[PDB]
Symmetry: C4
């Protein structure tokens, strides 16, 4: 017997430390590794797992040619041991999906899997291995979701979903699901948030989601949610923005609306509120998906004239390719430990990655209340060594 | 401790949704995947599994040349994680078999495995990993069985078996087996059914089997069975037939006998009775094994002048190869959820599939009481990319 | 909690039926499969397992060249799912060994593993994964053991061991081991048995071992053992001999001594006493390791003028290569089901197998109290297809 | 429920016997095996596991070229079934690390993982899969640890750590960690020990560590530790030294300080105190990492004029490459069984190993209170067969 996960506070922390790293591309040189993208991490009571959207092809084979394409019927949400490369011998196929979210509620796994035509997609709700519910596209425009772990409190899981234009006004909803059955949804208030994609969420008593505005905001939109309703929304106040592309530091302090500067497109990212402060992951480049750093902004969560980057951890050099990133939590007695993964994208359309495929490796970090050292943990592949 | 599966009613549903998909051929381009055919799905308390008849060779190797052949000593019923490709690293060999059925009774797995000479085959009964009984060919003419999951109620499993000509009058029996020991069998009444092959079965209080008449019927023969006897038989009334080959819609309403039109040969298929209505899977083509759709026929289960195709879900385009299909169930609290798999056959004898081997990938769908969207989930392989 | 296996009687049976088959050579065409020989089967409470002596090389690689050699430091007893091919992704290395025996006592696995110099080998006793005892070579001449499963009764396991010349008078012992600790041994009485190798054992109240006389006997030596001592010995009375090489049927009825005809060398084989009758496995050829059949000899266990082959099941054609064979049991409520495996040797020194390596596949059969059909289940490899 | 491991005495023993052997290089000829080094073994309640520092590349691929390099971001502590080769299908990635230690405390696994820049590395403490603590480099000079299993008593684990010059005075600490949280550390007294690296530890009531002095000592430094403090230190008295390089036998009896002869560099090794005697592993060569033997020195643990090598077991010939070695224990009722692994290094910089990569296979031995035989268990690879 296992109780449902509880609304625990976020553990104290002051730095992030290297956790698991898969070196999936390096290890895929001999065509053993499954082509993937949009990876993430989520944990149950016994293990943390790597998840990702597979492309139904092995890296370096002819079927991997052209996998830059986002949505096909041959993509499945797959799961593999955290820090290992995904191979036919160790993976599990979760569901058919070109967009997904996963979260464990203390007892069973829930998955949200979008697939089908762009104008008529549906989301399948999987609970304990069984398809228990669905969501039918209501704007008929690429129904899609987080690409990282959802969150569950006292048996009720919460997940953010979008249907509509990627570079214009769209529809954003939160769904509450309990044991695989949709209980309700809410349209996200547009009083502050103007665009919302690929939410990275975690628990700190309530569920906090820090997302991607793909339209007008170089700052990141955010939500605070409990097991019943949306409690609060806004954009991260930090005048040091964390989307890509974005303005140079310092930019505008925009707590209540998109910045309206370098607004589109964007990249999936994450953050952690810490008191009135905020930690923000981001690419080192302001324009491209290269490098990765995480900054702590003093008073960056609130409307203040005192914003300052008190810390900057450089985890992937700007000489190396990054990509998506997202939050996940690990239970730690009476608090949740904040962690994150970084997607290291190799292949198209990256400059000088002369291969026909598109894939990624994974690197992860966790927060501790200790002082960290420093280093660099990039993909590490010599693309010249790879089957094209 | 686990109780035996109960005679639960079929859950309500109004559409079918994409579940698991393995992309096994695409993934087999580098010779990692086991050659298979006659795949299916069956679930225990913890997982759903893919099953299939392997050919004792890896796809794309010289030993895969000529695997169009149906029965050899080198075929085994194998089991692999649902939605993954079958590789040496993840498969389990269940038994030697060129024809099989599998079903979980709540406590243990049962398997029925036919192998040996065509004129002197035997069926091995496996229960909890142990060979517990057997059936000796009594017509000495390719003793064979469902090629999809059997059903068990209150500890007694039911399975349909055929011995005799494939295109003429044969013998059809149902066997009741409890904990691996044959309790009894019955010869299927020929008052209505004239030919019976490859039954696709499920539970809706009683066991319903919808099968393949390979002789005179373009309509599908059916049985209703409990844990003791055959209760009812007939052919699906629907004037919209569901075998391949078959007449164009609409055809004859034949509740009580084979249609006698486009009667031979046929393809393994399935259906679900829903009140007086019936859902029927079928290839899109009336002549070939291409495409896949499932139709709901209003009042299609009964003798009525009101038959109408109220729904048509097109799940595989007619531009893509299909193959066998079959039912399986997943327990859902106090009802059984109806699902199905579709075999996507690639290689010989398919036109323009220029390879020497014969194999398949798998795609699955489950029923929900929600409105579905639409899409297309074919095999997806560029046969030109494959080792021949 | 699990009780120790009990001294159950052998189940009734009247024929043998196809069980698991791995097709390991066929499946090894692309160099995925581990080179092996001396395979066998043994079962615990949850699964039956394939065991074998690996050669520390993959089939078809340069390191597989010359694996005809019997004893090297690079051989390990490995274990893999029954009926699957042994690959790096699914095998477990049990111990370093060029000779082995394995048996489950109801609670834990025991293994006996011989390795080291021919003139100073030692046997390691493994119990529950821990090395718990050892046997030091006392004749300093290739200390060796069964190459098939041992047997355990009420917590005490029994295993036959040989140290000495392979074609002359040697030393033969039985060791009793309880929870991995050697309790005692006995020198096998030479009042009847003159040479003993590679015992195939099973339980029928007491432990019965039917072995290989590599010196003067074309008939097979046998022992009957309980958890304390050797109770009885002799040679199988059947005037229809079951070693290879051997005389044509019928030969001498030699219950009490080796036949002294076609006495050397020999092959590992098995048998099952059934009342006063005996079932005997053997190659179809009287001279070579080709084909495989099992015969039932009426009154073949006793001194009688009425010996007759009442049954002959031909399971591998004489056109196909066989090899070793051995008994194993599967618990069946209140009796033990008799089963056996057959080693299908491919490569050197087999005539027309033009490869540099030596390996094998596996096929198995179990006994039931039903009438069997017929068929042929050989290795199935086209050696011309294989990497040399 | 499982209690924490207890402070059990070391079991009696008088020899060492072949246990598991992986033949990883031989088996890696077809590019399936992960490049590794610094391997070791550690056991939980159910299994013994192989651990190693992977290089994030497959053996024989272009990414394996130049893996002689000690520290990169692409190295992870990985775990695989004991005696199997590490492949993508069977490995688990434990943590990012170019230096590590692992030990099971009776309930959960603990890992210590060093990674990052040489001048700013950190050690991550993993407990039950969760990162629970860290150590920040305090000398900023390659923070590093044992490369073999740590030890845990009554819930408190002990691990030796070094930060500083490799060939000069450095800092050496022991950390006590309970359930993943650092309780305390102590600076190792330099009253006797002058240099300490790569400690090989085991339990004999208290924790004994026998280590590597890389500076002035051809004799090995040692510590005795309980769950609270360092109790004792020194160098192994044995005038028969056990580091590499070292003087010819006999050398100086140096119980209290480094020998000051052939002092640098060194190799990771191990030993077992047995009463006043000591068993010592070592390479057969006094200068190179070739061959492996273990000697028992009478009164070699104490200050005595009676030192004599009473036993010498030659386990790897001097014609074969060895490498690191280390102790591990296996619980045996009411005592701990002493065992050890030997790293068999192949590739650079070994003379005549003409490949660009650097990797290793593994062989292991355990102690029993019986007389052993003899043999030779080297890597066994023909380097000429390998992909370069
Ligand atoms: C990756 O694929 C492209 C495109 O492949 C072509 O179209 C595909 C859909 C498929 O049908 C293939 O068979 C086709 O070749 C390759 O680009 C082609 O390369 C050929 C040969 O050099 C050239 O003649 C064509 O003009 C190219 N076609 C296009 C549309 O650009 C490319 O070579 C592949 N890359 C790798 C590394 O294999
Ligand atoms: C698939 O196999 C066929 C047939 O293989 C032949 O017969 C088999 C039983 C086996 O013994 C093989 O060694 C034989 O080659 C192949 O067709 C043959 O191809 C050869 C060479 O082109 C030709 O000379 C023969 O006439 C063909 N034989 C027949 C009976 O058609 C075919 O090439 C194989 N396909 C692939 C993709 O390898
Ligand atoms: C299988 O191996 C034999 C022998 O290999 C030789 O000796 C081995 C120990 C090893 O050191 C190899 O490098 C040696 O080649 C091979 O037989 C040799 O073949 C070569 C080349 O044709 C020939 O010149 C030698 O005379 C042969 N040596 C002997 C002793 O017969 C054989 O080719 C290998 N078989 C395969 C399929 O690779
Ligand atoms: C192992 O690698 C070396 C070095 O590789 C070179 O530098 C690497 C960092 C990488 O960038 C490679 O692309 C480079 O080739 C190889 O040595 C080189 O070999 C080439 C071709 O013979 C020669 O022209 C260069 O001078 C060499 N470079 C150096 C620095 O020595 C070597 O061939 C590789 N070994 C194997 C077995 O592949
Ligand atoms: C929602 O969860 C509640 C949990 O208890 C408390 O109330 C909620 C609103 C949060 O503030 C949480 O942190 C508190 O601990 C339950 O009381 C309530 O029954 C749940 N409601 C539903 C719809 O399940
Ligand atoms: C068969 O199973 C019965 C189950 O109970 C009920 O009766 C059967 C005939 C069905 O109608 C089922 O739906 C009902 O729930 C048992 O009563 C009976 O003992 C069983 N008989 C055998 C041969 O096992
Ligand atoms: C040996 O096992 C005995 C088992 O009980 C019976 O006696 C033996 C000799 C056999 O005939 C068996 O079939 C019987 O069931 C135990 O009585 C005895 O204690 C055991 N002795 C040892 C040495 O463990
Ligand atoms: C340390 O462990 C102790 C174990 O009991 C005994 O005392 C120690 C010092 C050793 O001598 C051991 O062999 C003995 O069995 C506990 O008493 C003590 O509470 C523990 N202290 C800490 C810090 O956990
Ligand atoms: C369609 C909108 C959406 C969010 C901006 O596009 C995405 C951005 C992507 C990106 O910027 O890398 C790739 C994604 N896999 C994707 N999601 C889907 C379903 O295609
Ligand atoms: C022998 C009759 C039988 C049913 C019509 O033939 C089948 C039809 C087949 C088909 O139409 O694809 C292939 C099958 N694997 C098969 N079953 C066996 C045992 O060979
Ligand atoms: C050394 C005597 C022994 C029994 C006759 O030889 C064997 C017969 C063999 C055989 O006839 O195939 C091969 C064996 N693997 C073997 N056992 C060992 C340890 O080498
Ligand atoms: C930096 C000091 C240290 C101990 C002498 O060097 C080592 C010796 C090595 C050796 O002699 O083989 C290789 C090691 N993997 C290593 N440890 C690290 C972290 O690089
Ligand atoms: Ca943006
Ligand atoms: Ca038909
Ligand atoms: Ca003989
Ligand atoms: Ca491969
Ligand atoms: Ca030294």
């Amino acid at each position: 017997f296992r109780p449902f996960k509880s609304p625990l506070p976020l553990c104290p922390f002051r730095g992030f430390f290297p956790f698991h790293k898969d070196n999936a591309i390096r290890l895929g040189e001999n065509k053993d590794v499954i082509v993937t993208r949009e990876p993430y991490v989520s944990c149950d009571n016994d293990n943390c797992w790597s998840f990702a959207l597979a492309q139904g092809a092995l890296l370096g084979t002819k079927h991997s040619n052209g996998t830059i394409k986002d949505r096909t019927p041959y993509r499945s949400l797959i799961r593999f041991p955290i820090g290992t490369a995904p191979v036919l011998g160790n993976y599990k196929e979760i569901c058919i999906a070109w967009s997904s979210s996963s979260c464990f509620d203390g007892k069973e796994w829930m998955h949200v899997c979008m697939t089908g035509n762009d104008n008529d997609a549906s989301a399948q709700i999987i609970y304990g291995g069984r398809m228990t519910d669905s969501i039918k596209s209501w704007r008929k425009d690429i129904l899609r979701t987080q690409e990282s772990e959802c969150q569950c409190i006292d048996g009720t899981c919460v997940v953010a979903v979008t249907d509509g234009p990627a570079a214009n006004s769209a529809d954003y909803r939160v769904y509450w699901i309990r044991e695989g059955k949709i209980i309700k949804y809410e349209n996200v208030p547009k009083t502050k948030i103007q665009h919302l994609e690929e939410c990275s969420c975690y628990v700190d008593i309530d569920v906090y989601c820090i997302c991607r505005d793909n339209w007008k905001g170089s700052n990141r939109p955010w939500m605070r949610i409990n097991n019943e309703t949306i409690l609060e929304t806004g954009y991260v106040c930090s005048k040091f923005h964390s989307d890509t592309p974005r303005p140079a530091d310092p930019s505008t302090m925009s707590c209540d609306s998109p910045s309206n500067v370098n607004g589109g497109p964007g990249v999936k990212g994450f953050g952690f509120k810490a008191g009135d402060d905020v930690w923000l992951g981001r690419t080192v480049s302001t324009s491209g998906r290269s490098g990765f750093e995480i900054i702590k902004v003093t008073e960056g969560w609130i409307n203040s004239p005192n914003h300052v980057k008190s810390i900057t951890q450089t985890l992937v050099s700007n000489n190396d390719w990054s990509g998506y990133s997202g939050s996940f939590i690990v239970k730690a007695k009476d608090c949740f430990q904040p962690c994150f993964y970084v997607e290291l994208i190799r292949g198209r359309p990256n400059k000088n990655d002369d291969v026909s495929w598109t894939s990624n490796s994974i690197v992860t970090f966790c927060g501790l209340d200790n002082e960290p050292g420093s280093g660099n943990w990039p993909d590490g592949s010599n693309i010249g060594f790879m089957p094209k």
